[PDB]
Amino acid sequence: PQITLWKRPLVTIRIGGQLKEALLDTGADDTVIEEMNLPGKWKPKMIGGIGGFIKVRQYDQIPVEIAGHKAIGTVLVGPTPVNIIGRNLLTQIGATLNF
Amino acid sequence: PQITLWKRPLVTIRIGGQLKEALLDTGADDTVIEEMNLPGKWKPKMIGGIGGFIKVRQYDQIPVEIAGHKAIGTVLVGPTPVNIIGRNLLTQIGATLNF
Numbered sequence: 001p002q003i004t005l006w007k008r009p010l011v012t013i014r015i016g017g018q019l020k021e022a023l024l025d026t027g028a029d030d031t032v033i034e035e036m037n038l039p040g041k042w043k044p045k046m047i048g049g050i051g052g053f054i055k056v057r058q059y060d061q062i063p064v065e066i067a068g069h070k071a072i073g074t075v076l077v078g079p080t081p082v083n084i085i086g087r088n089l090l091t092q093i094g095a096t097l098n099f
Numbered sequence: 100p101q102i103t104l105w106k107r108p109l110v111t112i113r114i115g116g117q118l119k120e121a122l123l124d125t126g127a128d129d130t131v132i133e134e135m136n137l138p139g140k141w142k143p144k145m146i147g148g149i150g151g152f153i154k155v156r157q158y159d160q161i162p163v164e165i166a167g168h169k170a171i172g173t174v175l176v177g178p179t180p181v182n183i184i185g186r187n188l189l190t191q192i193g194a195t196l197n198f
């Protein structure tokens with residue numbers, strides 16, 4: 001679909017058999033999801049954005065469905081105000097910026 | 100034009116007579132520009148990202164040219180590692196997400 005930016009580009013995603021709202025973020029290199037239990041092992045990691053660095057759990061090869069479109073990649077779980085779908089997954093579903 | 104997300108969507112912008120490289124961020128409610136001496140009255144403001152909040156100076160009605168596309172709106176100036184063009188200005192240049 002074609003999404004305008006008058007409102008936050010929030011879409012429903014399915015991760016770990018659970019439905020959640022996530023923000024399509026072209027400014028984010030990675031995908032950061034709120035605290036939740038995801039199957040498989042995880043490795044401690046640190047990422048940084050506008051107001052500093054945070055500690056996150058890194059889960060690899062996690063299947064994520066974004067608006068019916070499939071993607072399998074790295075998902076970071078940590079303290080975030082909103083679920084963020086970054087460029088690592090956006091590229092998998094062929095998302096592009098147009099104007 | 101059509102911008103892919105293989106790399107960070109960085110484009111050239113013109114603000115206050117200067118040319119800068121800025122990141123097209125659909126996940127940003129506001130536009131945040133690196134520290135610079137813009138004339139005019141400003142209002143103190145605090146914006147939050149991943150990691151926390153930072154103090155910024157709010158300037159209204161600032162004309163910004165994005166990739167040759169004219170726009171004008173609120174620009175926040177503060178300690179940011181990258182210049183960020185948010186939805187407030189992206190909507191003005193007819194930018195959309197497509198997949």
Ligand SMILES: CC[C@H](C)[C@@H]1NC(=O)[C@@H](NC[C@@H](O)[C@H](Cc2ccccc2)NC(=O)OC(C)(C)C)Cc2ccc(cc2)OCCCNC1=O
Pocket residue numbers: 023025027028029030031032047048049050081082084086124126127128129130131146147148149180181183
């Ligand atoms: C300037 C950023 C903008 C002000 C802020 N948006 C954002 O910061 C959104 N995009 C993240 C992008 O703005 C930054 C850009 C950046 C790149 C490199 C170094 C530093 C910063 N990327 C970024 O944080 O990447 C991560 C998530 C993988 C760590 C994500 C988000 C959304 C809502 C949030 C908090 C965070 O909380 C909701 C409040 C509104 N916050 C916002 O709209």
